Nucleic acid binder design. Sequence first.
RNA 1: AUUAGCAGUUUCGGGGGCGUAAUGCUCUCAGCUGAUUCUCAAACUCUGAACAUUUUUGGUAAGCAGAACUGGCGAUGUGGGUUGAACCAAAUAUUGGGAUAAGACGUCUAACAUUCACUAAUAGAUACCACAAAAGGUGUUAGUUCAUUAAGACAGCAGGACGGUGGCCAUGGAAGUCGGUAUCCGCUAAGGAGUGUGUAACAACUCACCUGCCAAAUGGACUAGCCCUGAAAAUGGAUGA
RNA 2: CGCUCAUAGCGACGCUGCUUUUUGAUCCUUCGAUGUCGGCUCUUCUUAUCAUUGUGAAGCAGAAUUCACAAAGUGUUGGAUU
Lengths: 51, 185, 205, 216
Amino acid sequence: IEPSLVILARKYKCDKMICRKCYARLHPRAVNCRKKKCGHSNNLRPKKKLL
Amino acid sequence: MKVINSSRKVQIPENVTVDVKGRSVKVTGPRGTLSKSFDHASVDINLVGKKELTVDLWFGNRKQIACIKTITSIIENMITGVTKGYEYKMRFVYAHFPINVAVTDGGRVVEIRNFFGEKIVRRIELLDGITCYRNEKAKDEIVLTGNSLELLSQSCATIQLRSAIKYKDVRKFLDGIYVSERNVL
Amino acid sequence: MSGAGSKRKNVFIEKATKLFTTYDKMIVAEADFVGSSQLQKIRKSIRGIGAVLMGKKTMIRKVIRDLADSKPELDALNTYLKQNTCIIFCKDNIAEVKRVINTQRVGAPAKAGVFAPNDVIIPAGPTGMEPTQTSFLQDLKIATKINRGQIDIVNEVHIIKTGQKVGASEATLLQKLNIKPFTYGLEPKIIYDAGACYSPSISEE
Amino acid sequence: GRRPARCYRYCKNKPYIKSRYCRGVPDAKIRIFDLGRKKASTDEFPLCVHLISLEKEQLSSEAIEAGRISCNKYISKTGGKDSFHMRVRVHPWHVLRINKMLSCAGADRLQTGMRGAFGKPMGTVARVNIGQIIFSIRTRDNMLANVVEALRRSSYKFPGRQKIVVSKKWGFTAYNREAYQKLKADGRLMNDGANVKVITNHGTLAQYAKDIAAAN
RNA sequence: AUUAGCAGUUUCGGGGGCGUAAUGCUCUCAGCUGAUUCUCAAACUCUGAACAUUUUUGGUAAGCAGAACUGGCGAUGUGGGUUGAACCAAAUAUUGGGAUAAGACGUCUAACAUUCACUAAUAGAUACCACAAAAGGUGUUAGUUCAUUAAGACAGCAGGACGGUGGCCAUGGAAGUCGGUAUCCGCUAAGGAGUGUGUAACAACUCACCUGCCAAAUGGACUAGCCCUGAAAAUGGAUGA
RNA sequence: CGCUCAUAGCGACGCUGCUUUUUGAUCCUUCGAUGUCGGCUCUUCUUAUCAUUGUGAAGCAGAAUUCACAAAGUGUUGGAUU
């Protein structure tokens, strides 16, 4: 298993930044939930990794 | 505040000819014809002779000022697609199960069997300007190629979206068909 | 406005306009990939004979010195619009400076977006290829031909110079292979004089 | 537990203190008030960072104590204690009352429902007005960023809108910063500990030189 | 009712240091005294005004209970508030003309034109009145203040990111990167005895700061208009439609 | 607290609301009369969702479980005691 493929696959569905009200994936350079339920809230964490 | 005038300029290369008639831009290139309407704008698309195309907007504020760069860059996408059209490269990542991929060229469709060992066959048509082919050289990679970016990248996104592991932990499995490269020539 | 903020230019201009009128023969260099590891091993040789002095495009504050000096910032060769420079100043060794300044270079692989010096050779051939690293080079746009029993494209002539960026996929072919063809470092452009040009020729030796 | 403070939020009653007539009222939840170094001389801390209330209400003693702990803890984590000295500029004197009725399912039998309705004292409360300071912090000028965040941290324990101003005075005094600096550099200041006393022109009728030789 | 110190006493009541031991010198530390300092009250006062709205007590509250002035409903319709006992206008003999009042003027519905912004939500639309809050938003409009820049700004893309040194300590091992403490230097435009990821610790990638292309405005912390989140209840559904 | 880690999940000390499925509070209607508990039966409505459908988070390796969203379309039991 190539490490570059794991990096590419984590780029698309693991390296996100999930809002705290809206459990909703955003891009890793986000600052705001893009959705109305959040209230466009500026409260968001990274997606947690594995070990 | 809404500014008095906010224009942009699109540079037409010499082998490309635009045929615009009232917010209906139609490029014609060596490799293929492409067209898109911009009838959702209060915009006078207008060309200066042969080399230029000037998107303009009189008294736009925001949500209108913000749209002239969008519909300038979309005409630039239509231009670059008909000089040297886009070619996307898509790579297979799998943990254990080797993903098989079928391709014919009736509707240029892709068929993705043995994805995660699922026995459902993921037949997917391509958008109507697009073909694709397997990479004999680089292993486990299918290269998409086309004339429009809104067709090519959307076909690639449908391959990528339909190649997900459901009902599991997506941080570990990571089996799919993802866009790797986004070249032009 | 100006003259404010952190790491002030008003404490650099005391070096950037005052000691720039006390020197005879100078070297217009190139600092486009030069390290600080490779720099500390050339800034101890120049330190006894001169200095390594540059304000880096703060140097159009030298226009007030050009009243009687008539010093050109744009009238000489290499008109200073597309590159980075760190010019080499000397008091004692104005003459034999060109030999230790072009010795301490190290050959190394390049990356993507580097300023591409005049001597770059792409790693090719049988010794510049593995049978396992073909599948990376088999990823690119250019189709390969069979020459001397290897999936490889041959390009050993110089095609790129200063002012053209290197592609992104070419960087791993230099980094992963041990092929380091050129020993690069500081590059003298113009031999500058106090109001004129001493030698309007290049000499990398 | 305690009744919701939306009952006792707004001051609609006449003020009602612990006295000869309000006998058995329980104590206040805020026990200690002034926190920090507080042996600090007034020359040390020049910065008066306040927390004023924008609406008039009854800030409960239980709320002032929680805001006090929330303000103490964040600066003690940030720069350690003695880097500030805050008092609290509001005291819970008005006592609340509860006409307590039983939660029993047959409660018609037992409780005098609105007969002798005058409630028994629960808690205390502080009757803040609009623009009345409740949390005054005196600290160094290198903590204008942190004590405003601590007063923001205490603004969420308090009912409604609180405003963190940075006062234009030397800190727990009446004189402005350049005016305290004038009163010190011209020699009309003294050292009463954590506060000044100005050499006035009022004992200057025979002599005032007992104040001169101990001037700040 | 009541908070905090500073000073005097300070030897004292207790702790001790100090001359070798003590009402002997000084420190918190108690206490007495003085000049300060924070909040102060229906049953405190030096001073001290001018059903509905307002003043107002009990109650968590009530379309609850009780008062005071005034105006009403009861007694009283009419015009308006879709509707309505009290609200607004305005009081009633029977009528005609005119101008009005509150209220309105797309249609129901008698009555309009011109003009400047804000709202892009299925929102919002006559006080009483038929609700909504704390807390939020890189939604947009207006604004306040501070900082950056032709000594080349933010942003993008790239080059550097070195030594003494792997700082002291501590330990299988801890070397920039698990921790307690310091934080200076050479060389320069620029280096944290390191903003991080990882490792037998490194290595390797990385951020601080500087510099290269570039060409002109950039960044922040607030303020408060409208709007959005907050915002869930039973028949079908109500800015009156 | 969660080994480290405030906010996966929680969350004291406080504060801000909603609901009318608890019981109070009140006495506005009804005392020339509204038949008052429970159960059986049957229909419809609510969403504050237990399952099912689609999704997103986790301290989600798989399995199991936990948090949330669009969701009220369709289900939501047999019994001993009273």
